[PDB]
Amino acid sequence: QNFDYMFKLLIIGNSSVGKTSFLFRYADDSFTSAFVSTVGIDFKVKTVFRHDKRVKLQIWDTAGLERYRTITTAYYRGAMGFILMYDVTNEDSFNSVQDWVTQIKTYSWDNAQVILVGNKCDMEDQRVISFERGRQLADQLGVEFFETSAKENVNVKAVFERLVDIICDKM
Ligand SMILES: Nc1nc2c(ncn2[C@@H]2O[C@H](COP(=O)(O)OP(=O)(O)NP(=O)(O)O)[C@@H](O)[C@H]2O)c(=O)[nH]1
Ligand SMILES: [Mg+2]
């Protein structure tokens, strides 16, 4: 009664890339510099308004630590969308993207949508992955791409809005 659509979204990617911070910025417009790893999985709910429709988002923030790989992967079932995040200052996190893609292909719905996100783009002096490299990989994968900053609120809303739109279109 209260919404027109309800989408389960997951934020996945290596530990420390900024997944919790991404959700904190989107939902609460807040940021902390503290790094406290997520245990298991957590979620927030947010309702957005798009094309005179009410879209309820149930957004799951997954732990990136390998210790929680199995329990977070159990929640891929039923997800309509994924934010697949790496950190532009962490080459390992970028190298891990194909493995995350395989995990999505294995444990999610065939028609689940995916956006690749290179976070921490404010950290230009520590950057090791260029924008162009991120976009190149996204195009090889056939997915949309954004660089973001949870810290300075760059493109965070844009990612969620685009993900809602491509899920809606795929329907
Ligand atoms: N400069 C900068 N720091 C960021 C940004 N996003 C997150 N951080 C910092 O990166 C660290 C890890 O962030 P966090 O959101 O906890 O990462 P996570 O991906 O949720 N880690 P985990 O998978 O272990 O739960 C924190 O110190 C946080 O302040 C960003 O856009 N820019
Ligand atoms: Mg976290």
Swiss-Prot record:
Belongs to the small GTPase superfamily. Rab family. Signal peptide: none annotated. The lineage of its organism: Eukaryota, Metazoa, Ecdysozoa, Arthropoda, Hexapoda. Interacts with Rph. Keywords: Cytoplasmic vesicle, Exocytosis, GTP-binding, Lipoprotein, Magnesium, Metal-binding, Methylation, Nucleotide-binding, Prenylation, Protein transport, Synapse, Transport. This is Ras-related protein Rab-3. Mg(2+) binds at residues 20, 38. One of its GO terms (cellular component) is synaptic vesicle. It is found in: Cytoplasmic vesicle, Secretory vesicle, Synaptic vesicle. GO terms for biological process: cytoskeletal matrix organization at active zone; exocytosis; maintenance of presynaptic active zone structure; neurotransmitter secretion; protein transport; Rab protein signal transduction; regulation of neurotransmitter secretion; regulation of short-term neuronal synaptic plasticity. The keyword Protein transport applies. Disulfide bonds: none annotated. GTP binds at residues 15, 18-21, 32-33, 37-38, 64, 119, 122, 150-151. A motif (Effector region) lies at residues 35-43. The chain holds residues 16 to 186 of 220 of the full protein. Involved in exocytosis by regulating a late step in synaptic vesicle fusion. Could play a role in neurotransmitter release by regulating membrane flow in the nerve terminal. GO terms for molecular function: GTP binding; GTPase activity; magnesium ion binding; myosin V binding.
